[PDB]
Amino acid sequence: MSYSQTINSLVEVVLVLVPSLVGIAYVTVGERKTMGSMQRRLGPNAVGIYGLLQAFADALKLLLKEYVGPTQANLVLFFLGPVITLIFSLLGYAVIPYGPGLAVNDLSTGILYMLAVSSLATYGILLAGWSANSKYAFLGSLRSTAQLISYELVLSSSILLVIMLSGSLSLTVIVESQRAIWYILPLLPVFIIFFIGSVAETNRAPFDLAEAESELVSGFMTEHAAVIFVFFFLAEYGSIVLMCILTSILFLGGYLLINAPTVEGSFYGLSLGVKTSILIFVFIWTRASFPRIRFDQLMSFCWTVLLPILFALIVLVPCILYSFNIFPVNISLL
Amino acid sequence: ATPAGPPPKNFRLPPPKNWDEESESTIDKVGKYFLMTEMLRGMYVLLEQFFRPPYTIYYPFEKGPISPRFRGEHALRRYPSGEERCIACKLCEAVCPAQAITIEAEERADGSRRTTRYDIDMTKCIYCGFCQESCPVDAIVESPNAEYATETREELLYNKEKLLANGDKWEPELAAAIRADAPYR
Amino acid sequence: QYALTTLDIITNWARQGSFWPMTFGLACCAVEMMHLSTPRYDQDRLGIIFRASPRQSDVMIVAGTLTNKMAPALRQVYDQMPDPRWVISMGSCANGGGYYHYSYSVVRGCDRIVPVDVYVPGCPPTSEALMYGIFQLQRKMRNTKITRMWYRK
Amino acid sequence: PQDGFQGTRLIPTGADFQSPPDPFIDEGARDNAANYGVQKSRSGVDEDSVEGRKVRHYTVNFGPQHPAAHGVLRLILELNGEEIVRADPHVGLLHRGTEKLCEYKTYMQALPYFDRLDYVSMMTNEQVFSLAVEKLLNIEIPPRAKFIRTMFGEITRILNHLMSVLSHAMDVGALTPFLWGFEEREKLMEFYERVSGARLHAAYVRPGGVHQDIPVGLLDDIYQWATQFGDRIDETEEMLTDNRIWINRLKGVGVVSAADALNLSFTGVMLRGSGVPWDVRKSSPYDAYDQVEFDVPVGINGDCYDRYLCRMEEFRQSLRIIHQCLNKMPAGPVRYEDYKITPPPRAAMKENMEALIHHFLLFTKGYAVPPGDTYTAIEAPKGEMGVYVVSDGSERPYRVHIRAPGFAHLSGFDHITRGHLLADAVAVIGTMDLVFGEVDR
Amino acid sequence: MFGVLFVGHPDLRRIMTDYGFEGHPLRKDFPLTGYTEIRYDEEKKRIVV
Amino acid sequence: ISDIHITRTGKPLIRIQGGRSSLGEHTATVFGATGQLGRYIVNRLARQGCTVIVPYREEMAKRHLKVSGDLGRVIFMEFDLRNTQSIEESVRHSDVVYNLIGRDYPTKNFSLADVHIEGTERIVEAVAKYDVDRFIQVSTYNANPDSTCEFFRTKGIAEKVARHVFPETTIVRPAPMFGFEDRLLLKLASVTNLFTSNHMREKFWPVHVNEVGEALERMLYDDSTAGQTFELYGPRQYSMAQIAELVDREIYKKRRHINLPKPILQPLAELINRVLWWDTGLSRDQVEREFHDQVIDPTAKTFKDLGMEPTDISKWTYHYLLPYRPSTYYDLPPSTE
Amino acid sequence: LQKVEVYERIKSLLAGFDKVNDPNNITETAHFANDLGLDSLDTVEVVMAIEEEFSIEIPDKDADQIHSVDKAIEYILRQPDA
Amino acid sequence: AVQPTKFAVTVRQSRNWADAKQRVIAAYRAWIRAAPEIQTMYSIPFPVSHIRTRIRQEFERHRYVNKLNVVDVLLQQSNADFQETMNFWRQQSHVMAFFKELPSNFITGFLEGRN
Numbered sequence A: 001m002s003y004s005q006t007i008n009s010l011v012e013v014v015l016v017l018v019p020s021l022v023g024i025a026y027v028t029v030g031e032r033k034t035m036g037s038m039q040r041r042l043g044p045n046a047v048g049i050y051g052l053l054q055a056f057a058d059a060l061k062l063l064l065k066e067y068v069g070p071t072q073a074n075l076v077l078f079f080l081g082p083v084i085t086l087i088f089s090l091l092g093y094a095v096i097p098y099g100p101g102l103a104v105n106d107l108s109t110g111i112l113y114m115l116a117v118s119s120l121a122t123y124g125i126l127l128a129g130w131s132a133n134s135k136y137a138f139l140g141s142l143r144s145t146a147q148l149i150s151y152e153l154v155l156s157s158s159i160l161l162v163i164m165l166s167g168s169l170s171l172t173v174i175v176e177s178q179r180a181i182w183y184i185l186p187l188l189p190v191f192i193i194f195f196i197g198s199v200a201e202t203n204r205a206p207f208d209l210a211e212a213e214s215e216l217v218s219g220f221m222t223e224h225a226a227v228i229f230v231f232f233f234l235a236e237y238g239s240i241v242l243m244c245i246l247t248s249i250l251f252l253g254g255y256l257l258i259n260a261p262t263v264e265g266s267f268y269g270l271s272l273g274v275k276t277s278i279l280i281f282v283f284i285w286t287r288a289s290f291p292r293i294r295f296d297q298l299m300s301f302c303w304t305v306l307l308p309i310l311f312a313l314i315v316l317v318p319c320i321l322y323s324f325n326i327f328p329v330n331i332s333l334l
Numbered sequence B: 001a002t003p004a005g006p007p008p009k010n011f012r013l014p015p016p017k018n019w020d021e022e023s024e025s026t027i028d029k030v031g032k033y034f035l036m037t038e039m040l041r042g043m044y045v046l047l048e049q050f051f052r053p054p055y056t057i058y059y060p061f062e063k064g065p066i067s068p069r070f071r072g073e074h075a076l077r078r079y080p081s082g083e084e085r086c087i088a089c090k091l092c093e094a095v096c097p098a099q100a101i102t103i104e105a106e107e108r109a110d111g112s113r114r115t116t117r118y119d120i121d122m123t124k125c126i127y128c129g130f131c132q133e134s135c136p137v138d139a140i141v142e143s144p145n146a147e148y149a150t151e152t153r154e155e156l157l158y159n160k161e162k163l164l165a166n167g168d169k170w171e172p173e174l175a176a177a178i179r180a181d182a183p184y185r
Numbered sequence C: 001q002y003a004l005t006t007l008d009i010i011t012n013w014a015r016q017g018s019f020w021p022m023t024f025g026l027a028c029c030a031v032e033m034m035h036l037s038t039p040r041y042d043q044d045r046l047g048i049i050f051r052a053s054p055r056q057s058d059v060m061i062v063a064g065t066l067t068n069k070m071a072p073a074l075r076q077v078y079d080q081m082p083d084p085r086w087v088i089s090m091g092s093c094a095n096g097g098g099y100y101h102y103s104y105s106v107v108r109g110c111d112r113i114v115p116v117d118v119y120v121p122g123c124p125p126t127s128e129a130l131m132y133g134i135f136q137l138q139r140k141m142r143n144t145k146i147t148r149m150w151y152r153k
Numbered sequence D: 001p002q003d004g005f006q007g008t009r010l011i012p013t014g015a016d017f018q019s020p021p022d023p024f025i026d027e028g029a030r031d032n033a034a035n036y037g038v039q040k041s042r043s044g045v046d047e048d049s050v051e052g053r054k055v056r057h058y059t060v061n062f063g064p065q066h067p068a069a070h071g072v073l074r075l076i077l078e079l080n081g082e083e084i085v086r087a088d089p090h091v092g093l094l095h096r097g098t099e100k101l102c103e104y105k106t107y108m109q110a111l112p113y114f115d116r117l118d119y120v121s122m123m124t125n126e127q128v129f130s131l132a133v134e135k136l137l138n139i140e141i142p143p144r145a146k147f148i149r150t151m152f153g154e155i156t157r158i159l160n161h162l163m164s165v166l167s168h169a170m171d172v173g174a175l176t177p178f179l180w181g182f183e184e185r186e187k188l189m190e191f192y193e194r195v196s197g198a199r200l201h202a203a204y205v206r207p208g209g210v211h212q213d214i215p216v217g218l219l220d221d222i223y224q225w226a227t228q229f230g231d232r233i234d235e236t237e238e239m240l241t242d243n244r245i246w247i248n249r250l251k252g253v254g255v256v257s258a259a260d261a262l263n264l265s266f267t268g269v270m271l272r273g274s275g276v277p278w279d280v281r282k283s284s285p286y287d288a289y290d291q292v293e294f295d296v297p298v299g300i301n302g303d304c305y306d307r308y309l310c311r312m313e314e315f316r317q318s319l320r321i322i323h324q325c326l327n328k329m330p331a332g333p334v335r336y337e338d339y340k341i342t343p344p345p346r347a348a349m350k351e352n353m354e355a356l357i358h359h360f361l362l363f364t365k366g367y368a369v370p371p372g373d374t375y376t377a378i379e380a381p382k383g384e385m386g387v388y389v390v391s392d393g394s395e396r397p398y399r400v401h402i403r404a405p406g407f408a409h410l411s412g413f414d415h416i417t418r419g420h421l422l423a424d425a426v427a428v429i430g431t432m433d434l435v436f437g438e439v440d441r
Numbered sequence E: 001m002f003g004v005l006f007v008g009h010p011d012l013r014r015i016m017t018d019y020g021f022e023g024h025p026l027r028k029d030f031p032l033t034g035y036t037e038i039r040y041d042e043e044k045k046r047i048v049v
Numbered sequence F: 001i002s003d004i005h006i007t008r009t010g011k012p013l014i015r016i017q018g019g020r021s022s023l024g025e026h027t028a029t030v031f032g033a034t035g036q037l038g039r040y041i042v043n044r045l046a047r048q049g050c051t052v053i054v055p056y057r058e059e060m061a062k063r064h065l066k067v068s069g070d071l072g073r074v075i076f077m078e079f080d081l082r083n084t085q086s087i088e089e090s091v092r093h094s095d096v097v098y099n100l101i102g103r104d105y106p107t108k109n110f111s112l113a114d115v116h117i118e119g120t121e122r123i124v125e126a127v128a129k130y131d132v133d134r135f136i137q138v139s140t141y142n143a144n145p146d147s148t149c150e151f152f153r154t155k156g157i158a159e160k161v162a163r164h165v166f167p168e169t170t171i172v173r174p175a176p177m178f179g180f181e182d183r184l185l186l187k188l189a190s191v192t193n194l195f196t197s198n199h200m201r202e203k204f205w206p207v208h209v210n211e212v213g214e215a216l217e218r219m220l221y222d223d224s225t226a227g228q229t230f231e232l233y234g235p236r237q238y239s240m241a242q243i244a245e246l247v248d249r250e251i252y253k254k255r256r257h258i259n260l261p262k263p264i265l266q267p268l269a270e271l272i273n274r275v276l277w278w279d280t281g282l283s284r285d286q287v288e289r290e291f292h293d294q295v296i297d298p299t300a301k302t303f304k305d306l307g308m309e310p311t312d313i314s315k316w317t318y319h320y321l322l323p324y325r326p327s328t329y330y331d332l333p334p335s336t337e
Numbered sequence G: 001l002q003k004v005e006v007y008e009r010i011k012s013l014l015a016g017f018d019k020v021n022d023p024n025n026i027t028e029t030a031h032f033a034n035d036l037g038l039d040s041l042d043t044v045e046v047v048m049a050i051e052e053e054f055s056i057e058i059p060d061k062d063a064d065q066i067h068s069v070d071k072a073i074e075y076i077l078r079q080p081d082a
Numbered sequence H: 001a002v003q004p005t006k007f008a009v010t011v012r013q014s015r016n017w018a019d020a021k022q023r024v025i026a027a028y029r030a031w032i033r034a035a036p037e038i039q040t041m042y043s044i045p046f047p048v049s050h051i052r053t054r055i056r057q058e059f060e061r062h063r064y065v066n067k068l069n070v071v072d073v074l075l076q077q078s079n080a081d082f083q084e085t086m087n088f089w090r091q092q093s094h095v096m097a098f099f100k101e102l103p104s105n106f107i108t109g110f111l112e113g114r115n
């Protein structure tokens, strides 16, 4: 190579983490300003020009706010759960292609990597809620466990239908395969279902049961203050963007367009971000449109509506592939 | 339950309709179920709100609307000569519903019936306006002022010195509010 | 002194810009309080979002009458609110008991229970009067000496 | 009294006059699905009277510091997992002794207390107290006051329903309709603050009419608002009525039968939701109601969904009444023309002797109300709001008792909620439309 | 409020007054402001009567 | 004790006794009241209707004191020790001046000598300048101008300066204090206090802070306490090891300490105190006190001279240490072993 | 249990009670009221103390029956807990 | 109807003095049985002996009542105070307001002002 391995690895990680953590801060302001417009409001417009420094004041305010360790709380776990949720939520950005193979890890199995990292971070929510040893946080954590028993099979079922078309499990190859057609056209029911599960996966509304404010006070994060609360917020909003990126990876062609490398690489980055930003809007639009579902009804919806339909596609879709001679070669090509 | 006499005509509900009596087509019913149709309409209605003017005003640079009858902080008022209008009748002390007014009077050096004490406990007041309603001479009024929040509660115990100072400062509105609202009183 | 002021500036600017009151309210003053969250005043445009939990709250606004049956609960959730913390007393009832001052069941002002940083007059204070008291408290934050205080001791 | 010192005849009790059901026609051990195995004693082994007093269900204090508590309620819930086995609402956390304080006030001095009971429905609370004193005063308030009180009575009804229905939707998770409807109520508090000097506690409706006359631009601005308020009702209708998440959160929830709703002291939508046609403004017309046309929304399933559909219809019926009042507003005084009861105009008080004496006596002594007692009830936005006023013949009431609709409703909470989940309790608090200024008094 | 027993009543307890409250405040002989009042005490770190 | 108090300057005070709405007739000034002791004297004076001037430095840390008294009762004045005017403005309406200003450790602008000697000098010189009746200065136990510990020496010289300027000084010497927010029981239940020079074997007669605030209240009413010297100590002698044993029995935690040799620890402790901005519990002199032992100097009045009998620290461990019990042992009754 | 074991602990408890007239009067057939000078409330405390020591719950119906030491001994043997 | 709470007892009149006699003993027993349970619920730092002393004194103030209708009001109040305490509706301040932890002579009263 031309320069050091460690430096190339260094600047690539920075170019991924730093712009993403900046992107996370603006989704929080953007949601507050988007719902307000739907609510005939303005949203943040006085912490920085047009309100563009609001997330930083919120972040800085909490890192200077006193932490409390409850006497009834198992304290090592009280701190371990938010730290697990944050680290393991942010790890999911290590396999996103911002171009063909332009990922921190172009892994051959990056889809399974994302399922492992998301599942491990939800276990922090469960642990932190239980550790608090307060009723509402206890009821919050039990809902989060019910919720993962609801959406995890749904996403894993949905993605397996994308892998049947792509044949790869590598995020770049799936995007490259969509140069034929975006997977939202042939897999239109799967796109709706995967999007529904992603909203449930992120504990976003209408599925905000674990942290519901009108039923529990803050659910799992009710005893959590200062930096611990901020760890859970960055995990949640970083999960929203990551799931919007993954939905764009799997159904909307990823980075596909709708000095010379820099000009080209920019178009891939914009194209992925534009499609991600549209799906980020759909989340915020969804929180603003609907009531909260009841947690019994979310479990029944995933288990008697979504999964029965997804199992039937899992049968139907390969039968269409063998019939039309369109099973993808599973070798390395794209 | 229902009114006595003949029962209301057609108060009894029609017999229930069966599943195969509902006159909706399967294509429509199944389409609405799977396409999430009614909730797409709600999503759209939010979209046209998104492209409507907001309602928001930029307080404190812009203020919401208040009327001449608005009841704000208290002020004691004077005649055009600078003589106090208050004559110590004690009517407002009597009518107060919260006993926030304490008045002590005497004959002044010149033999005038004037107050020696005039206190309003602004943390006992209910801001009803009954005291300005009862005044025979338009002395006690409630200003259009609502922005007078303080650091301590001692700052909310107004004596005659604070209330006359309020009238001395706010007289142009107090006069314009009375002018605009007097015929209705 | 220049650097210790700058830390004080950046600290107080954050406390001002992220001003989260508890979603706690006792009676009709809470009606005017929730009208600051509605489109006309849009309390979020200034960074003010009501948090349900006292663990995620910066300020408690006492918007309502404090009865003797509630005083243990007001004090308990105030203690459970982390530092830095502030109390706004909104209304005559929370100020000095108001119209129920001569009642057998009413605390004659919430500052017999908790310390109070700014008092808003009115029953009810108008939505703008409460905003004026929140602007007093942020002006008090902006003049609060934190890092230059330690430098004096 | 004296006989009670030693043992005497025991005072008869409802248990004594119990009667055995007839076995020929009796069918079933439970004609009610409220007690159909969705309460306590449906699990475990032994009852909680002996050997069970040592254990507890999962008990959680739902409030007071809680959003769904909407204020100052301490609802002690016993949960079997996520299911409610027993609900014990604890109130009195906003009890401030209003009914005792009224006894050391003149009748004028007590009227602002009624502003602060159901404190989203101020002018309606004022009306029920103004109609009880006017009945004991044996006076007939003028026609313009009756039309102002019915028009501001329905402006108040819309204001309450905006707070009630959209707070209830906020609890279930729908945020946006709350924001839209609070611009409309922010519009309507201008009409309050233009006739009175207050956005909330007007002190406007008083025994004898209203305090002042409406200003000369108010009727045109009320009509201008009226020409667009239909669209406001329809866009909130557009997010909830057909929403499938709204329907499955409220349909079949908080079900009360018609015969139990009467036995529970339910009134208003809580009663009309169960299929009973009952409106206090239809059955005992007061003010100008018997001079206007309006429909009465009545549900058929007695659940949270029917109660929601009845309240969204009352938006449209209140706007319908308001239009007729604007059209039928007569000229004349807004105060009964007797200065021994109502204060004289300031002009007359500064110009004439008998006007000054009457102004002086009405603000120091108050007016005397002829001795007697009365129960007076009106269709408040939350149900039958009533007052029992006892009169000495003097200028201070001997007894003022407020019959609050939400006091009667929160008492039937455990009856309709035991067996539902924790979210369904949130749903039932908002459909039952509680303000604890009236509950505690 | 008045102190009237209701024989046969299930769960007859206070509904309006504070928990430890003694007296019946709607009685005429009960004084308007009562007998006691509360404050938070700095030395004891609690509400005292 | 009576309805009439007559002061040294001879002014009478006609008192109405009970409640925060009544007339205690005394105007006190309490320097150093935002610390640990200062609230108990201020609550005692304020809740009996006395005007209390509270000279403060940091605005947000004084706020708990206003709750103690009625409206207009607790007056906050913002002062500095090296601002003589603010000192003089604070004591000149007063009939009693409490000096509770002290610091265990040196700071970058105050040495132990500067906060004890010079701070007392200004406070006492203003007490003399405006002829204030009573002056209760709080020194420490083991205070001695011939001492070698900076704490016990400097608080021993301020004792002599106060008497030399205002001979009617009531000098009060408390033992190490326990209570709510005490730096005695809460440090032994903490996890930061791991370093130590002796084996926690130094002895002292610990005294409840609640009974010391009561003692300072009684010195105002017992005028004969003027010009006297009071040592306010507890009923038993304990080591740091015996106290730490009680704490472990109560919190159920079995805390542990790392012992260091004093020629090694003391230099480090002087570095931590000089490089950290917060009270670290560690400093060169606090290590020196750590090796010293408490002596109750005779010819000094006691709690009995106030007619008070102090209670033992053991009776108070459950009340103050319960927040530190782990959830498993929290629901248990007090140890009472 | 053993009869002598379930009696020895009672004497220590009964003598340990503050205001019995004299510790000698406790016998196997002694009465709380007639002999040991205990009124209604003192006797209820004594059954309460006996139940706590034996770690058993004495029900309202048979709690009243224990007005003498012998009755306490027979109930302790009858109830199967220690 | 709505369920009565955990310790809710139906309000019934005492049949005779024997009835009242047995109820008062039942109430006194139930209170002193619960004193250990009150202590850990309310984190009382005093020992249970003091708590039971206070229960005894409350019962002793109604010792000399010879009226069935006054005893039954009293048996009502204790039932509600017991139910209120055991369900943890009241809090520590209320329970500590119950523990108090007048001049003893004319001359002592005179010299201090009345008391």
Ligand SMILES: NC(=O)C1=CN([C@@H]2O[C@H](COP(=O)(O)OP(=O)(O)OC[C@H]3O[C@@H](n4cnc5c(N)ncnc54)[C@H](OP(=O)(O)O)[C@@H]3O)[C@@H](O)[C@H]2O)C=CC1
Pocket (backbone or CB within 6 Å): C153, F031, F032, F033, F034, F035, F036, F037, F038, F056, F057, F058, F080, F081, F099, F100, F101, F102, F103, F104, F110, F115, F138, F139, F140, F141, F174, F175, F176, F177, F178, F183
């Ligand atoms: N507590 C104990 O174990 C013992 C205490 N003592 C003495 O008792 C007194 C009270 O004890 P305690 O309340 O626990 O002590 P704290 O250290 O908690 O309080 C000391 C007080 O002195 C003030 N103060 C310190 N340095 C300065 C300064 N340079 N300028 C102005 N004010 C200053 C502090 O104000 P601020 O908070 O603003 O800094 C604080 O209010 C002290 O004098 C102490 O030395 C003696 C023996 C034992």
Ligand SMILES: *P(=O)(O)OCC(C)(C)[C@H](O)C(=O)NCCC(=O)NCCSC(=O)CCCCCCCCCCCCC
Pocket (backbone or CB within 6 Å): G039, G040, G041, H021, H024, H025, H031, H038, H054, H055, H058, H059, H060, H062, H063, H064, H065, H071, H074, H075, H077, H078, H081, H085, H095, H098
């Ligand atoms: P023996 O024949 O001596 O019988 C003794 C008794 C007491 C039965 C008498 O001989 C007797 O019959 N006297 C009349 C009845 C009587 O003493 N009082 C009526 C019973 S009700 C009562 O006394 C209630 C007392 C207060 C409430 C219970 C005590 C506990 C209060 C709270 C404790 C701590 C809570 C935090």
Ligand code: SF4
Pocket (backbone or CB within 6 Å): B085, B086, B087, B088, B089, B090, B091, B092, B093, B103, B134, B135, B136, B137, B139, B140
């Ligand atoms: S009513 Fe008016 S004029 Fe009369 S005493 Fe009161 S303020 Fe003065």
Ligand code: SF4
Pocket (backbone or CB within 6 Å): B092, B095, B096, B097, B098, B099, B100, B101, B120, B124, B125, B126, B127, B128, B129, B130, B131, B132
């Ligand atoms: S407006 Fe205020 S001062 Fe006037 S009568 Fe009403 S409560 Fe009293």
Ligand code: SF4
Pocket (backbone or CB within 6 Å): C027, C028, C029, C030, C063, C064, C065, C090, C091, C092, C093, C094, C098, C099, C122, C123, C124, C125, D116, D119
């Ligand atoms: S101050 Fe007025 S508006 Fe606020 S709670 Fe009290 S009575 Fe209601």
